[PDB]
Structures are given as C-alpha cells and as structure tokens.
C-alpha cells in the first residue's frame, strides 16, 4: 500500500518522531538543550533493533495531528494517550504504560477534591487528552469550575508557573508529569496531586493509519525489550518502578 512506508524508513535508516519537548519525564529538553526521557530511551532502543536512527523533532503539541498527516513527522511518541477520539484519526502501537489525569493544586488552597474547585479557575494543556476529557465528561469539572472553562496553555510548564502564581487554582495534568516535575523542582510538598474520577489512560505510539508495518515493527520490538532487560532498565531509570502493563 502506498502509505505503508516501512521500506523507506528501513532503507533510509531514519524515522522522524515528534514530541512536546517539555513533557517530562517522557521526552524533554534538558539543562544543556539535549533531549532525554523514557520515550527517548525507549524509541531509541526500538529503532536500534532495525538499525534505524531517530530524528527527534520538537513540535507544537497543538499541531501534532497536522504534522503527522502532512508527513513532517512519522510518529507521535511522547506520553501520547491512546484515546477513542484519537483512534478516529491515527493508528496506535500496543500501549506501554498506564497514566491518569490528576488535578494539581497548591496545598495552601486546601483543595483535595474536584468539588472544592467549585467557582475556582482551572487550567489545562490545550492540545492534551486531559482537556478533551474535561469537555467530554462535563460532570467531573467543567460544570462546576469558574466560567465552565479551562484556561489553555501550549505547555504544562507555563500552566504550572501560572498555578504557582495563583493565576489558576487547579491544573488538569498527567500524573506522570506532575510526579516527576514536582520532585525534580523540589516542591512535591507544596502541592496536592489527586485523581478526580476520569478513567485511566494508557500511552502508546501514534502513526498514520496507513503505516501498518511500522506499527507491527514497534510492537515486535517491545516484545524483545520486555525480556532483554532494557524495558525494565529504562523504567527504573525514569520511574523507580516497573511500569510494564504486565
């Protein structure tokens, strides 16, 4: 099939992967500007099995579908939540990690439950699966937060600066990000982090629907990495635990 480009990636020994370069701990710009993270390590190890080098392309998370469809990237791999809505537009690998959407509030707010966001200001990442679930499940938060809206941000880092500065009262965000970020910045004990009854997510790798062979190759590589020690090594490095879905 024309859009099944595996043979091209294999012969060029290259594939382009798009990511939000602030999304810790999955794929992010480090203190020296180089990219690191769980997905950086995992994708590198996957494509190593085929002698393929990854070309990492930071993207605007708002534009990820457009960049994939237009061919400027070949995969979305960056804590990319595999949702039903997204399955209408892209194909997914098998999922490799669970995730949950949480609220983050300052401890000084005293807010540890969604109902105490009544009349309070919520923020979200504009292009996130979390924001999509905020709109799709309005009984959870949208109906009760100020203006029945979320302040929208391109990146969670900006949203978190706004939370720190009382510009928003709560932030809807991936738990993996919140846990890593707050620990890295030394401020775990300044914030509450809690689920609010959204259903769990899983992360997977997104491709163009027609790239069916590529998806199989990612899945086959996962099978090797689970038993060769590498998945566990990467998991321990970034999470201090085994996040394998088994």
Ligand X SMILES: N[C@@H](Cc1c[nH]c[nH+]1)C(=O)O
**3-state SS assignment for residue 108:** helix
Q: HEC profile for 168-213?
A: CCEEEEEHHHHHHHHHHCCCHHHEEEEECCCCCEEECCEECCCCHH
Closest distance between ligand X and the C-beta of residue 201, in Å? 7
CB of 63 to ligand X, least distance (A): 12
Contact predicate 226/233, CB 8 Å: no
Q: Mask: binding to ligand X, 132-171, rule CB under 6 A, as x and -?
A: ----------------------------------------
Window 60-119: residues binding ligand X (CB under 6 A)? 61, 78-81
Q: How far is the CB of 232 from ligand X (least distance, A)?
A: 23
Place of tokens 């970020």: 181
Contacting residue, 9, 17, 20, 170, with ligand X by CB under 6 A = 20
H-helix or E-strand spanning residue 57: strand 53-58
- Least distance (Å) from ligand X to the CB of residue 68? 13
Beta strands in 77-169 (DSSP E): 91-92, 97-99, 101-106, 122-125, 150-153
Site for ligand X in 115-134 (CB under 6 A): 125, 128-129
The one among 39, 169, 174, 211 contacting ligand X by CB under 6 A:
174
Of residues 23, 153, 180, 191, which one binds ligand X by CB under 6 A? Answer: 23
Between 156-164 and 175-184, two packed helices, what is the crossing angle to 10 degrees? 60
Shortest Å distance, C-beta 11 to ligand X: 30
Contacts with ligand X, residue ranges (CB under 6 A): 20, 23, 61, 78-81, 125, 128-129, 174
């Amino acid at each position: 099939t024309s859009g099944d480009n595996w043979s091209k990636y294999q012969s060029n020994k290259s594939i382009t992967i798009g990511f939000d370069s602030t999304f810790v701990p999955m794929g992010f710009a480090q203190k020296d500007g180089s990219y690191a993270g769980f997905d950086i390590d995992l994708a590198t190890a996957v494509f190593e099995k085929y002698g393929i080098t990854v070309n990492w392309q930071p993207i605007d998370w708002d534009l990820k579908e457009a960049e994939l469809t237009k061919g400027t990237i070949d995969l979305i791999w960056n804590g990319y939540s595999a949702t039903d809505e997204r399955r209408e537009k892209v194909a997914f690998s098998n999922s490799y990690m669970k995730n949950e959407q949480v609220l983050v509030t300052k401890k000084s707010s005293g807010i540890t439950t969604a109902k105490d966001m009544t009349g309070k200001t919520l923020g979200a990442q504009a292009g996130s699966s979390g924001y999509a679930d905020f709109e799709a499940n309005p009984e959870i938060l949208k109906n009760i937060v100020a203006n029945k809206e979320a302040n929208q941000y391109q990146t969670f880092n900006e949203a978190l600066i706004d939370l720190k500065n009382d510009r928003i009262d709560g932030l809807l965000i991936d738990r993996v990000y919140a846990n890593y970020y707050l620990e890295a910045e030394g401020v775990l004990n300044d914030y509450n982090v809690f689920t609010v009854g959204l259903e769990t997510e899983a992360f997977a790798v997104g491709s163009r629907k027609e790239d069916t062979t590529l998806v199989k190759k990612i899945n086959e590589a996962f099978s090797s990495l689970y038993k060769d020690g590498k998945f566990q090594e990467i998991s321990q490095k970034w999470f201090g635990e085994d996040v394998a879905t088994k």
